[PDB]
């Protein structure tokens, strides 16, 4: 009879020590909080990537008697066993804050049992498996191996109750087998999206008619069925099934046919982040360089809005964003407003570096700054040297360079400040460019919202916008992320962690989470789920307008409010949901033993029903 | 980051008065940073910093290829071709021409046709030894002093 | 302070394209500062920086006094 109190934890995922997904970040940022709790009882397991593992893993020698404590011996012999049978792997530490221990199976050292396994899978779970699909070959390989490893452990270990957490389908094949072979681990499966969710939303309706689609048919339609089956099989074979967000839990219910037992939101290592004025000034420098020759508005009266993230035109809501800004521009012209909104779109596209036109802008305004500085320290010297000697300060020499530098700013007649900072490797087909053309936001002086597409990551060493993303974000006034498909939404979340009011939606994971915890705290949530497409856009313009018409003091209220929401997103608090999931996996596995530890019988239908 | 962590710990000790000063936290981030510098086996430091819009036909690249200066460790002269004007605000070589020139040791301008040669001349006005030629305008003028 | 102001005024005019640059406020605090440098008539710049705890006897002082520097 096993120890529920002092248990083992094995977290499995494709991303363990190779950034291939956004799960990499979850796992990496969670390490610290879980390593603190489980110390050397915790291991992450994943497919060894032979291209990268050396940049991320402190390779350890696992055979040395020191490598493991005495109670943790069994894992070591468990590994020992695996090597006998010719299963090669890299034990080691994953070089991140927390430095959790890691088992990385060489999928090549097992590639042999390929056919034998594709078969054994189909004849226990009816999961088809074409040979042209490497990922599933890899995901089956990984699966059989880990299940193998865990049986071994469960065999040798007999003191520790064993929980095994699996993330996303690619690391889920182990889940059916663990249930089939009646292996003595309680299992947990978290999905960070559904295959069908992505695929259905990859064209341009969803959140309404998802409850009435024939999944078996739609998976078919996408050449996905075998992948779909692994994702479902994992979801039913798990003792506890979870998703990262409420919104995704609803998608999972109907697309995978099992109602999630709970939600495991993504937290951040909030210390890792924790200025606005100091950084806003760097954005100012950019704007003067960009609107040189026709800089006709007041920076003390302009607001900076931004959107950022992967370039997913429809799914990240770049379409709503631009459209809403065009409609925000009308409202401000008609209302006769005094303010300007310069709106950045930071979304990496294929590009051929900066446009000549945008490089010049900056260089000429930088030289103006230099000349002014040289000229005024000259006046300084002259005023002071007069005063100290007691008993037009600009000489002709300075006037001439001053004049030259100001003439350098004039721009060709009828030429407007570019809507893009880079050379697009597809100017004609680009979804963003074409959408801001359609709405005719061309940065003309009449236009009260200005547009700036920057199709590349931000680095502080750039000739244009000399900010690192984190710097730029702080410098700004409002983040705008009208996402349509977005299981978590790190960017809005981490935007808020940095003390910057933001707009998300109720169909973002982060959004939906945030909903249950209004607008006074610097988070607006656009309803993209129940209003019609157009009413959603209009609600977005309302939130923007409201924000523009905010007094200097009304804004500093909000800023200060959101900044205090930051502690709500640390793993210190969100990690408690991983604990409910684990402890529900235990309660379900050893119902009897669990009653003895708690002093009664607690309810076991949800993680929240338990606690 | 790590060093000021140490400075803080050393001072705070002494000021309170009355061995691995690097905690585990710091050793991990140090080790990652060191491993991130490992280059793929057999990769030598490029001879060029940029993307050549005609890599195969380029006169400079082809000549340094024909002389086989490939920057391997045995080579006692390293070769860096930087096909672009120098600007302080660059990711790679953050210097203006004038900064860079000054920070070098020797400018080499073996010109064949050059009625003056402002480059070697201004090089010299910035206090840097330089090699020109008796067929360079500036060289010729210099030979008479 | 005065010159960084002049700086910002010259830069803002320029950046916006399309004579006394010292405004009255500055000329004032400038004048005050210059006037506070005036020294009481016939008071020369001292030959010493410190309060001498024996001003009359000190060899150094007396010798520079004797040579009337």
Residue A489 β-bridge partners: none
Q: Which residues of A touch B28 (CB under 8 A)?
A: 58, 93, 95-97, 99
Q: Where is C52: in which H helix or E strand?
A: none
Please say whether the beta carbons of A283 and A298 come within 8 A.
Answer: no
Which long-range CB contacts under 8 A does A204-210 form with residues at least 24 apart?
Answer: A204/A314, A206/A484, A206/A485, A207/A507, A207/A528, A207/A529, A210/A251, A210/A254, A210/A255
Q: Which residues of B touch A99 (CB under 8 A)?
A: 24, 28
Interface mutation target, options C12, C15, C20, C23, chain A, most CBs of A under 10 Å:
C15
Residue C2: which of C17, C16, C18, C20 has the closest Cα? C20
Please say whether the beta carbons of A136 and A227 come within 8 A.
Answer: yes
Which other chains touch chain A, taking contact as 3+ CB pairs less than 8 Å apart?
Answer: B, C
Of C7, C16, C38, the CB nearest to A376: C7
Spatial separation of the C-alpha atoms in residues A440 and B4, rounded to whole Å = 52
Residue environment code for A173-192, b if the CB has 16+ CB neighbours within 10 A, otherwise e: bbbbbbbeeebbbbbbbbbb
Strands A89-94 vs A101-105: parallel, antiparallel or unpaired: antiparallel
Task: Decide: C and B in contact? Rule: 3+ Cβ pairs under 8 Å.
Answer: no
Q: Which residues contact A30 (CB under 8 A, 6 or more apart)?
A: A267, A571, A575, A578
Q: For residue A598, what are its two tokens?
A: 């708690």
Please say whether the beta carbons of A244 and A488 come within 8 A.
Answer: yes
Angle between helices A356-387 and C2-16 (to 10 degrees): 150
Hunting for tokens 């007691």 — which residue is that?
A: A390
Q: Which residues contact A581 (CB under 8 A, 6 or more apart)?
A: A165, A188, A190, A240, A242, A261, A262, A264, A607
Q: Which CATH class is domain C1-57?
A: special
Residue environment code for B55-79, b if the CB has 16+ CB neighbours within 10 A, otherwise e: eeebeebeebeeeeeeeeeeeeeee
Q: Where is B113: in which H helix or E strand?
A: none
Contact A376 C4 (CB under 8 A): yes
Interface mutation target, options A28, A36, A99, A363, chain B, most CBs of B under 10 Å:
A99
Interface mutation target, options A372, A400, A404, chain C, most CBs of C under 10 Å:
A372
For A293, the closest chain C residue by CA position comes to C17
| Resolution number, Å | 3.0
For A387, the closest chain C residue by CA position comes to C34
The CB density around residue B128, as the number of other CB atoms within 10 Å, is 16
Residue B124 labeled ligand binder: no
Alpha-helical segments (H) within chain C: 2-16, 24-35, 59-66
Query: Judging by beta carbons within 10 Å of its beta carbon (0-12, 13-18, 19+), is residue A45 exposed, middle or buried?
Result: buried
Of B28, B38, B91, the CB nearest to A95: B28
Reduced to 3 states (helix: H, G, I; strand: E, B; else coil), residue A474 is: helix
Contact C3 A405 (CB under 8 A): no
Spatial separation of the C-alpha atoms in residues A255 and A243, rounded to whole Å = 13
Q: Do domains A1-267+571-611 and A268-352+430-570 have the same CATH topology?
A: yes
Reduced to 3 states (helix: H, G, I; strand: E, B; else coil), residue A488 is: coil
Whether A55 has its CB under 8 Å from any CB of chain B: the answer is yes
In angstroms, what separates the C-alpha of C48 from chain A's closest C-alpha?
Answer: 21
Residue A25: which of A197, A242, A266, A249 has the closest Cα? A266
Q: Which residues contact B58 (CB under 8 A, 6 or more apart)?
A: B52
- Tell me phi and psi for residue A42, to 5 degrees: -85, 130
Strands A340-346 vs A449-453: parallel, antiparallel or unpaired: parallel
CATH level 3 topology of A1-267+571-611: Rossmann fold (3.40.50)
Spatial separation of the C-alpha atoms in residues A5 and A508, rounded to whole Å = 36
Q: For residue A413, what are its two tokens?
A: 């007649």
Q: How many CA atoms lie within 13 A of A583 on its CB side?
A: 17
Spatial separation of the C-alpha atoms in residues A487 and A421, rounded to whole Å = 30
Of B24, B35, B89, the CB nearest to A463: B89
Residue A394: which of B71, B85, B14, C13 has the closest Cα? C13
Chain C interface residues (partner A, CB cutoff 8 A): 2-4, 6-7, 10-11, 14-17, 19, 21-22, 30, 33-34, 37-38
What does chain B come to in residues?
Answer: 145
DSSP A152: H
* Domains of chain A, residue spans: 1-267+571-611, 268-352+430-570, 353-429
Backbone region of residue B68 per phi and psi (left: phi > 0; alpha: psi in -120 to 50; beta: other values): left
For B88, the closest chain A residue by CA position comes to A463
Contact A459 B91 (CB under 8 A): yes
Centroid of chain to Cα A594: 37
Interface mutation target, options C3, C31, C32, chain A, most CBs of A under 10 Å:
C3
Residue A457: which of A535, A346, A306, A375 has the closest Cα? A346
Q: For residue A158, what are its two tokens?
A: 């007999």
Reduced to 3 states (helix: H, G, I; strand: E, B; else coil), residue A437 is: helix
DSSP A570: B
Spatial separation of the C-alpha atoms in residues A107 and A114, rounded to whole Å = 10
For B94, the closest chain A residue by CA position comes to A461
Reduced to 3 states (helix: H, G, I; strand: E, B; else coil), residue B14 is: helix
In angstroms, what separates the C-alpha of A5 from chain B's closest C-alpha?
Answer: 28
Cis bond upstream, residue B93 (ω within 30): no
Hunting for tokens 């893993």 — which residue is that?
A: A57
Q: Which residues of A touch C34 (CB under 8 A)?
A: 387, 390
Spatial separation of the C-alpha atoms in residues A337 and A328, rounded to whole Å = 11
Residue B119 labeled ligand binder: yes
CATH of A268-352+430-570, one of 3.40.50.2000, 3.60.20.10, 3.40.50.300, 3.40.50.720: 3.40.50.2000
Spatial separation of the C-alpha atoms in residues B139 and C13, rounded to whole Å = 47
- The CATH architecture of the domain made up of A353-429 is Helix non-globular (6.10)
Q: In this structure, is the dihedral angle defined by the CA atoms of residues B65, B71, B73 and B74, taken in order, positive or negative?
A: positive
Contact A95 B91 (CB under 8 A): no
- Tell me phi and psi for residue A409, to 5 degrees: -90, -30
In angstroms, what separates the C-alpha of A519 from chain C's closest C-alpha?
Answer: 37
Residue A10 β-bridge partners: A43, A164
Reduced to 3 states (helix: H, G, I; strand: E, B; else coil), residue A484 is: coil
Q: Which residues of A touch C16 (CB under 8 A)?
A: 295-296
Q: Where is A102: in which H helix or E strand?
A: strand A101-105
Contact C3 A392 (CB under 8 A): no
In angstroms, what separates the C-alpha of B94 from chain A's closest C-alpha?
Answer: 9
Q: What angle do CA A76, A136, A213 make, to 5 degrees?
A: 125
Spatial separation of the C-alpha atoms in residues B76 and B70, rounded to whole Å = 11
Spatial separation of the C-alpha atoms in residues A360 and A368, rounded to whole Å = 12
Interface mutation target, options A28, A52, A53, A55, chain B, most CBs of B under 10 Å:
A55
Size of the A and B interface in Cβ pairs below 8 Å = 34
Of C14, C21, C34, the CB nearest to A387: C34
Contact A368 C2 (CB under 8 A): no
Strands A478-480 vs A262-263: parallel, antiparallel or unpaired: unpaired
Whether A413 has its CB under 8 Å from any CB of chain C: the answer is no
Spatial separation of the C-alpha atoms in residues A291 and A415, rounded to whole Å = 11
Hunting for tokens 């210059």 — which residue is that?
A: C34
The CB density around residue A400, as the number of other CB atoms within 10 Å, is 10
Q: What is the 3-state secondary structure (H, E, C) of A513-554?
A: HHHCCCHHHCEEEECCCCCCHHHHHHHHHHHHHHHHCCCHHH
Of C3, C14, C17, the CB nearest to A383: C3
DSSP E strands, A309-374 = 340-346, 351-354
The CB density around residue A1, as the number of other CB atoms within 10 Å, is 10
Please say whether the beta carbons of A106 and A90 come within 8 A.
Answer: yes
Spatial separation of the C-alpha atoms in residues A345 and B14, rounded to whole Å = 51
Cross-sheet strand order for the sheet of A340-346: A449-453, A340-346, A302-308, A478-480, A502-505, A523-526
Whether A399 has its CB under 8 Å from any CB of chain C: the answer is no
Spatial separation of the C-alpha atoms in residues A44 and B106, rounded to whole Å = 55
Q: Which residues of A touch C14 (CB under 8 A)?
A: 368, 372, 402, 405-406, 409
Residue A507: which of A492, A529, A491 has the closest Cα? A529
Please say whether the beta carbons of B128 and B101 come within 8 A.
Answer: yes
The CB density around residue A166, as the number of other CB atoms within 10 Å, is 27
Residue A15: which of A212, A194, A140, A171 has the closest Cα? A171
């Amino acid at each position: 009879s096993r120890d529920l109190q002092n248990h083992l934890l094995f977290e499995t995922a494709t991303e363990v020590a190779n950034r291939v997904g956004g799960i990499y970040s979850v796992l990496k940022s969670k390490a610290p909080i879980t390593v603190a709790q489980y110390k050397d009882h915790y291991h992450l397991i994943g497919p060894l990537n032979k291209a990268t593992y050396q940049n991320e893993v402190d390779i350890l020698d696992w055979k040395k008697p020191e490598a493991f404590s005495d109670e943790m011996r069994p894992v070591q012999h468990a590994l020992q066993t695996m090597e006998s049978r010719g299963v090669h792997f890299v034990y080691g530490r994953w070089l991140i804050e927390g430095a959790p221990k890691v088992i990385l199976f060489d999928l090549d050292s097992v590639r042999g049992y390929s056919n034998e396994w594709k078969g054994d899978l189909w004849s226990l779970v009816g999961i088809p498996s074409p040979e042209n699909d490497f990922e599933t070959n890899d995901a089956i390989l990984l699966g059989y191996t880990v299940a193998w490893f865990l049986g071994e452990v469960a065999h040798l270990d007999s003191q520790h109750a064993i929980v095994a957490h699996f993330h996303e389908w690619l690391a889920g094949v182990a889940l059916p087998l663990c249930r089939k072979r009646r292996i003595d681990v309680v299992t947990i499966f978290t999905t960070h999206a559904t295959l069908l969710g992505r695929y259905l939303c990859a064209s341009g309706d969803f959140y309404n008619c998802l409850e009435s689609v024939d999944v078996d048919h739609e998976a078919g339609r996408f050449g996905i069925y075998h992948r779909y089956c692994i994702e479902r099989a994992a979801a039913h074979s798990a003792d506890v099934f979870t998703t990262v967000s409420q919104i995704t839990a609803f998608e999972a219910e109907h697309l995978l046919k099992r109602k999630p037992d709970g939600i495991l939101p993504n937290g951040l290592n909030v210390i890792k982040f924790q200025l606005h004025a100091l950084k806003k000034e760097k954005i100012n420098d950019f704007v003067r360089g960009h609107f040189h020759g026709c800089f006709d508005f007041d920076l003390d009266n302009t607001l900076y809005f931004f959107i950022a993230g992967r370039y997913e035109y429809k799914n990240k809501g770049a379409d709503m964003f631009i459209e809403a800004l065009a409609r925000l521009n009308y409202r401000l012209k008609v209302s006769g407003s005094k303010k300007t909104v310069v709106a950045f779109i930071v979304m990496p596209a294929k590009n051929n570096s900066f446009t000549v036109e945008a490089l010049k802008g900056q260089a000429e305004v930088r030289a103006l700054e230099n000349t002014v500085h040289e000229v005024t320290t000259s006046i300084g010297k002259r005023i002071f040297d007069h005063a100290i000697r007691y008993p037009e300060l600009l000489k002709s020499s300075d006037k001439v360079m001053l004049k030259r530098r100001i003439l350098a700013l004039r721009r060709p007649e009828g030429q407007l400040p570019p809507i893009v900072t880079h050379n697009m490797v597809d100017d004609a087909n680009d979804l963003i460019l074409n959408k801001i053309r359609q709405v005719q936001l061309f940065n003309s002086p009449s236009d009260r919202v200005k547009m700036i597409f920057h199709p590349e990551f931000l680095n502080a060493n750039n000739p244009i916008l000399g900010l690192d993303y984190d710097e730029f974000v702080r410098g700004c006034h409002l983040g705008v992320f009208p996402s349509y498909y977005e299981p978590w939404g790190y960017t809005p979340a981490e935007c808020t962690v940095m003390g910057v009011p933001s707009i998300t939606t109720n169909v973002s994971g982060f959004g939906s989470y945030m909903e249950d915890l209004a607008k006074d705290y610097g988070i607006y949530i656009v309803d993209r789920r129940f209003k019609a497409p157009d009413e959603s856009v209009e609600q977005l313009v309302d939130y923007m307008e409201e924000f523009v018409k905010k007094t200097a003091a009304q804004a500093i209220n909000q800023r200060n409010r959101t900044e205090r929401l930051s502690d709500l997103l640390d793993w210190k608090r969100m990690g408690l949901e991983y604990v409910k999931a684990r402890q529900l996996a235990l309660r379900r596995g050893y119902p009897d033993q669990f009653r003895e530890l708690v002093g009664e019988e607690l309810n076991d239908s949800n993680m929240d029903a338990l606690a | 980051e790590v060093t000021t962590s140490i400075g803080k710990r050393i001072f705070d000790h002494a000021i309170r008065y009355p061995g691995e000063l690097l905690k585990s936290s710091d050793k991990v981030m140090l080790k990652r940073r060191i491993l991130a510098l490992r280059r793929p086996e057999g990769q030598l430091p490029p001879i060029v910093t940029h993307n050549m819009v005609d890599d195969a036909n380029d006169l400079i690249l082809n000549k340094i290829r024909q002389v086989q200066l490939f920057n391997s460790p045995s080579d006692r002269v390293k070769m860096i071709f930087h096909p672009e004007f120098l600007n302080a605000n660059n990711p790679i070589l953050g210097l203006d021409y004038d900064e860079f020139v000054r920070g070098c040791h020797l400018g080499v301008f073996p010109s064949y046709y050059e009625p003056w040669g402002y480059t070697p001349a201004e090089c010299t006005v910035m206090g840097v030894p330089s090699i020109t030629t008796n067929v360079s305008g500036f060289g010729s003028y210099m030979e008479d002093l």
